[PDB]
Write a structure and sequence with these properties.
3 copies of one chain form a homotrimer. Chain A has about 70 residues and is mainly α. The termini of chain A are far apart. The interface between A and C is medium-sized, with 33 and 32 residues. Chain B: This is General control transcription factor GCN4.
Chain lengths: ~70, ~70, ~70
């Protein structure tokens, strides 16, 4: 019985060792993923571009009328 | 001895839970945006900023030439 | 025999505590990373901008010629 329990503890130690290795790998993977906190600057640039392009399109339509 | 047994029982439970949790986290990580992909998106946007700046300058000049406010 | 088993149970308790803490931390870190599914609207805007800007460039070239 004592042997059997010691064997179970050894098996669990081995499982925990494997999980530690897996967690180490996941830490590396997550470090190469984009943070939500870094999204906003890009989002703002895109929103500004959309506004600027809308204005340009409106101006170009007006110029086409006048030139033609 | 039974105390030791009960301790291993509770540790066993914790380990099974951690196995499940780590499996779930592995899946969540796979669904996240890569920094490398973000960088390429940022590069496109930087090019767009330059092109739009130029267009704005060209359109301002055209407006002047046709007498448009 | 008993002393050895206790030392391994103690070892396992400590390693599990360590693993639990780092998994809890990883969970929160992962939650702060951007999901690919939440990128699609931004990606579509950038694609739309590429097209709109290319079109504007062609229109503006044509206007510059016609205006003189």
């Amino acid at each position: 019985h004592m042997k059997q329990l010691e064997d179970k503890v050894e098996e669990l130690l081995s499982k925990v060792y494997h999980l530690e290795n897996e967690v180490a790998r996941l830490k590396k993977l997550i470090a190469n993923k984009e943070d939500k906190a870094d999204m906003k600057q890009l989002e703002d640039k895109v929103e500004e571009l959309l506004s600027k392009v809308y204005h340009l399109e409106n101006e170009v339509a007006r110029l086409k009328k006048l030139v033609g």
